[PDB]
Design a protein around this nucleic acid. Sequence first.
DNA 1: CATTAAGCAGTCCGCG
DNA 2: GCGGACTGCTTAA
Length: 903
Amino acid sequence: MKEFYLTVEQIGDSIFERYIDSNGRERTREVEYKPSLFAHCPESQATKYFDIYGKPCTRKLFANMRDASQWIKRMEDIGLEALGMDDFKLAYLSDTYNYEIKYDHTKIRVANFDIEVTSPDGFPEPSQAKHPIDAITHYDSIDDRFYVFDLLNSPYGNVEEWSIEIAAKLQEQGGDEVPSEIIDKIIYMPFDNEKELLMEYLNFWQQKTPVILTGWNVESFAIPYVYNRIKNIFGESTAKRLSPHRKTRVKVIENMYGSREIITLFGISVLDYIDLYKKFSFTNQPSYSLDYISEFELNVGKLKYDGPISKLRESNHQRYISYNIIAVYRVLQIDAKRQFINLSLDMGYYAKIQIQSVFSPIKTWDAIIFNSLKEQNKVIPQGRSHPVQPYPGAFVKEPIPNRYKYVMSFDLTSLYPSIIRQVNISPETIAGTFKVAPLHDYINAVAERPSDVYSCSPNGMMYYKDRDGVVPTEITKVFNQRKEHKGYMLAAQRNGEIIKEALHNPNLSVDEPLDVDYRFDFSDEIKEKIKKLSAKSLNEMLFRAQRTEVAGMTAQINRKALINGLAGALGNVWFRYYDLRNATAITTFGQMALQWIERKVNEYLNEVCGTEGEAFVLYGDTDSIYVSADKIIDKVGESKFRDTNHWVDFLDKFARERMEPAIDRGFREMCEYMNNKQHLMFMDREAIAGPPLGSKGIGGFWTGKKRYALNVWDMEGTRYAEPKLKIMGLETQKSSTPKAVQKALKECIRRMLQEGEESLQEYFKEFEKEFRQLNYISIASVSSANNIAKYDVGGFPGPKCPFHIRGILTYNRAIKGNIDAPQVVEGEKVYVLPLREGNPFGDKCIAWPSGTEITDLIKDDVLHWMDYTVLLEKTFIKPLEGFTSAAKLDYEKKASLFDMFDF
DNA sequence: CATTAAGCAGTCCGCG
DNA sequence: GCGGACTGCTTAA
Ligand SMILES: Nc1ccn([C@H]2C[C@H](O)[C@@H](COP(=O)(O)OP(=O)(O)OP(=O)(O)O)O2)c(=O)n1
Ligand SMILES: [Ca+2]
Ligand SMILES: [Ca+2]
Ligand SMILES: [Ca+2]
Ligand SMILES: [Ca+2]
Ligand SMILES: [Ca+2]
């Protein structure tokens, strides 16, 4: 097999590398790496090295990495560019692995762990580590085993061994319900004292040294706690045994009333699953507790126990250990679904970076571009300092706030990367400039053609047409990868709807799920067999189709985020290829493209409808347009349609056969206008929206920019079994909105769009009447808690104190002196409730850590003093008023002359 | 070591 | 009692 790296570090003049050899064995080596950098030389000097602009360079080979670094400083002082890769471990990886890395994940040790620490005096701070570590569960991906380290004797209580037999039993029979499929994979190790537990854990660690280290909050809790605890008991150099190279770096962050730290373990790549989830999931959650995320991702119930966590070990050690084990398994279950570790490995090896560098689009692209240029013997430019400077982005049309009955949307494929490729935007492809006209002159095709020689953007930039740029070249590679996975995702999505259709008439038989590949559209023969399957088989097939869709989503959406990241990186001062000429060449082209095609679509539809001057395009944002299809439906006549699916089919055909070719013609003309390298402005129909035929539903509405709702029947070629609400920007979509309120507002919208005014009024009336019965957490608002200290004046609110921050200070005063009440952590999220006048908290609101029950001592008073009237008005009534006024609809029946009668 | 556009909630201030 | 300027937060893209 081909060799591949596991980890790489620079430590002084040494590169320390862990890797897999040609026999598939894990190895380590220390290399006194000899780096090269480059300097511009005169043309007369023959050389094989040229910078990206074609200027000759001389190679400077250094005896060590420090010498190379000192030379960079001298060059800076002289005032001359020092070219080449200055991150030497990236150069080392590039020299060592001068081919496309093919990696085998089964050879990569992936460790998932978590620890328990009993603390009778508040949160056990990792930097102090003053309490015993009383449980560790460490899953090893190579052994496929959960290694469980259990402390039986502690200053906080002596306990009996954990029972695997009780652990497996149902909770309803007094067991812990540890999942049956991991029971045989548990290796249990009790210890009489913490010192022997910790010594054994370190010996184990040496035997099974993580390459990838993950888990839930391991970077901020588990790692620094273990490191500091071991340091306190055995000394710092024993703690350094957690690094395979015995080197660590301690990072102390001052928070005025916090003071915590992160430990860098050299030779390990830490991928905290919380950070992976936040980067790759495209969610914004009201809480990041493992309970909440597991419930969201897996539909599993909360891990229930009686009393505080500080008393759980002494009162129920059995459950304490089982829950430590289950918590580790839950992360593995989330990853089996989301596949973020897989993604990280794919991206890291593709770029040739430390795996943890996948968090950084700048580092990722720097490496990709460096490796690409190095293949051609090209030399990369020195990174330079740049002042931060705002620049313009995308265009968003102001919509007329209204109901919109029939809507079809159209969207440009991968817009910014497509613009890069179409125009040929790269640092080395710049050909010059032209004199700009106002943007509207390009939009309306009245401005002089910029160039008949070069490829242009309406920002004034010209690019060569006849040569390749490294940015377009490398962005295309990832774009093509992305395209493949999105195809798999959409096929799985379509396959899912086929299964949902068939679940309407399940067969009464004993059968099995069909062994199929969900990444490809089912054949007719498969569809025939599906229509004869049982409900059991269908529901299992749907699970597999959806899991396939999620895997496709992870792979495609994050490759999209990477390539969009490159367009954005051009606008970040720390990017080696930072250049606002290129960053704005993209955004300005985008603005032109959207507004050009708005004009073209309006022109085309007036033409085919036999009219003039009517506005068909009602809205657009960045790369999408929304077309009112009312006149298209009316031109045929609504009574001609047999059912909803009939008009949906009609509009689908209209978009594909008539509109899309006109859109294509429009964009090909624009490409010619700008004299672009290649036409890549591909705008396809996205959504088809409207009310069910014969209903009083309004179909859709806009309240303003980035705020709308649509009743969608078909999305990007997926014909839904049941209509799906597409809601953007409205409170239903916001993590700050109370859970039960999101639910109620969504039903209000559903009724508006699908059923009409009277249906809405009936729901509103019910919700208002039952509002006070909802669980307090379900009706609490949520906010992030930043700069708490700034507004903290002796426990009371300082000037301009935000509402949520005021709530936190109220809470802090209420829990003062109580050592067991959970503290609000700076930067994390809080539930927020308004409080009625005269409450014993002495302020208008309270806030507490999100994803938790408010502490028992103050919970009673919160429930008693909650201001339901304020809560309903602020979170529910006021947003609903926005929706209904825009839609020209009432959520409550207006008084009228008819009120004089007895109906 | 490291993208912009834009809506809504809330504070402060003005307001015979 | 509301608007206008301004901060904070959180979306859409
Ligand atoms: N983080 C982001 C998100 C978006 N955009 C810009 C670039 C995108 O090309 C454009 C439109 O984003 P979309 O969500 O419409 O997705 P794309 O057009 O990129 O991809 P596709 O439509 O193929 O999914 O907005 C950006 O610069 N940075
Ligand atoms: Ca725990
Ligand atoms: Ca599309
Ligand atoms: Ca798009
Ligand atoms: Ca059937
Ligand atoms: Ca879009």
